[PDB]
């Protein structure tokens, strides 16, 4: 009973939407990488938690098994992160708004060691669904393809459970074009649009990729005491 | 040439296809992590050498500038690798068709530290396209948008030239997308079936990506 018409799937997935966070952001000190990856990394670690409550609103998620929902997301989580966050920067051209009270440039990025590159394909992204004029029901059809197809490649059991998220994705599919179809473009558009839109999500998988390469780099390198730490221990 | 009806499109990007390159595999000395890795490379760099001859065939490459040609190949070629072996390998469930002399089975894989991991992942792969009953038209088709949709989100985007490029990219996989609902519509499927059933191939692009990223992650690894 994840078989409802278009315009039911679409309220779901508008319904499941979580909030938009506020960052503890203190305007007075200045950055530094270990504060600045300290105040992403709290706010990402915010979202996680609002993120799970989301997954188990998207229609078909919760038919699944528990081991297959934490697959998913486990697969999905910094892909959604990063949709989220893109989708939210799309107002604001050059910058990207981690938090309505946060909204870093490209040159903030730097403040980080190989962070840039991951702003600029975050950017770059954000650009991509401006000129598109890319809507917020298609939006919430992307994040739940996301979640849904991102694990899915990875006994009779089994085999159902892939079969039940490949019917899914086909109704989610159904969705977008039918929101395309009501906006009034050609059969053409439709097709042609929903063929950019899924591109794009292999831009996310690629910019997930990357940034998880580059967080993983980061927890590498405090295997070695910091200046922040050794400075107190003397003072 | 984006003048190109679904037709001609088709037949250019099935005559553009390579010939299925054979490895200088020598039955007569046991396998390696070093011998094994060096047959592969060897494989994978002659296929380079075909893959520029078949990128310069796909409808709309040849019109990019040099620099843009190169960097469209930098980031999509393993991806083209992978897709091309994922191809090849579908007639033969739990083995890598890498060339007709060279067929391996997953417990191969495990010859190399950590390779059996994009082993399995592109058995997948394998596995759904077989379930999908990819045809060659659509393979073809999908091959070319890889080459053309990985860099494009890169490129530069702050010059008149940069910016007419990425617009002749996106109206060339336009045309592309038309190709693949044409070769459906011909195959007789409903509209709803069409449109499910380009969404499904693109998806697989996704996990094509992630497997490369993989992939060059491995690589990098076994540089040591
Ligand atoms: C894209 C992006 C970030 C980002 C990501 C990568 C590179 C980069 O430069 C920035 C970091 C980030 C920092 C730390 C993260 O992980 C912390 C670890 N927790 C544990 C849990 C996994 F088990 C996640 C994730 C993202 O700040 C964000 C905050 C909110 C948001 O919507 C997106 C981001
Ligand atoms: C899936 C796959 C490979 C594969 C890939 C990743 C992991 C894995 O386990 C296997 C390796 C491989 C090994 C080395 C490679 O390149 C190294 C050097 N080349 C030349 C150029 C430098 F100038 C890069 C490329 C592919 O063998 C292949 C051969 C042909 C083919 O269609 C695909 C593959």
Redesign the interface.
């Known amino acids: 009973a994840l078989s409802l018409t278009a315009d039911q799937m679409v309220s779901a997935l508008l319904d499941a939407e979580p909030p938009i966070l506020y960052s503890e952001y203190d305007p007075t000190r200045p950055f530094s990488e270990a504060s600045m990856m300290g105040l992403l990394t709290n706010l990402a670690d915010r979202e996680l938690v609002h993120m799970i409550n989301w997954a188990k609103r998207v229609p078909g998620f919760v038919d699944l098994t528990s081991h297959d929902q934490v697959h998913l997301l486990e697969c999905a989580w910094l892909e959604i992160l990063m949709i989220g966050l893109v989708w939210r920067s799309m107002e604001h051209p050059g910058k990207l708004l981690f938090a309505p009270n946060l909204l870093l440039d490209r040159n903030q990025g730097k403040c980080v060691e190989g962070m840039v590159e991951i702003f600029d394909?975050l950017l770059?992204?954000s650009?991509?669904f401006r000129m598109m004029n890319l809507q917020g029901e298609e939006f919430v059809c992307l994040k739940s393809?996301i979640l849904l197809?991102?694990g899915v490649?990875?006994t009779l059991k089994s085999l159902e459970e892939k079969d039940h998220i490949?019917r899914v994705?086909?109704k989610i599919?159904?969705t977008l074009?039918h929101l395309m179809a009501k906006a009034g473009l050609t059969?053409?558009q439709?097709?042609?649009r929903?063929?950019?839109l899924?591109?794009i999500?292999?831009?996310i998988?690629?910019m997930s990729?990357?940034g998880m390469?580059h967080l993983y780099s980061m927890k590498c390198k405090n295997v070695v005491p910091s200046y922040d730490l050794l400075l107190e221990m003397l003072d």
């Open positions: 394909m770059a992204t650009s991509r393809i197809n991102s490649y990875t490949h994705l086909d599919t159904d074009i059969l053409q439709q097709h042609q929903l063929a950019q899924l591109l999500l292999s831009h998988r690629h990729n990357k390469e």
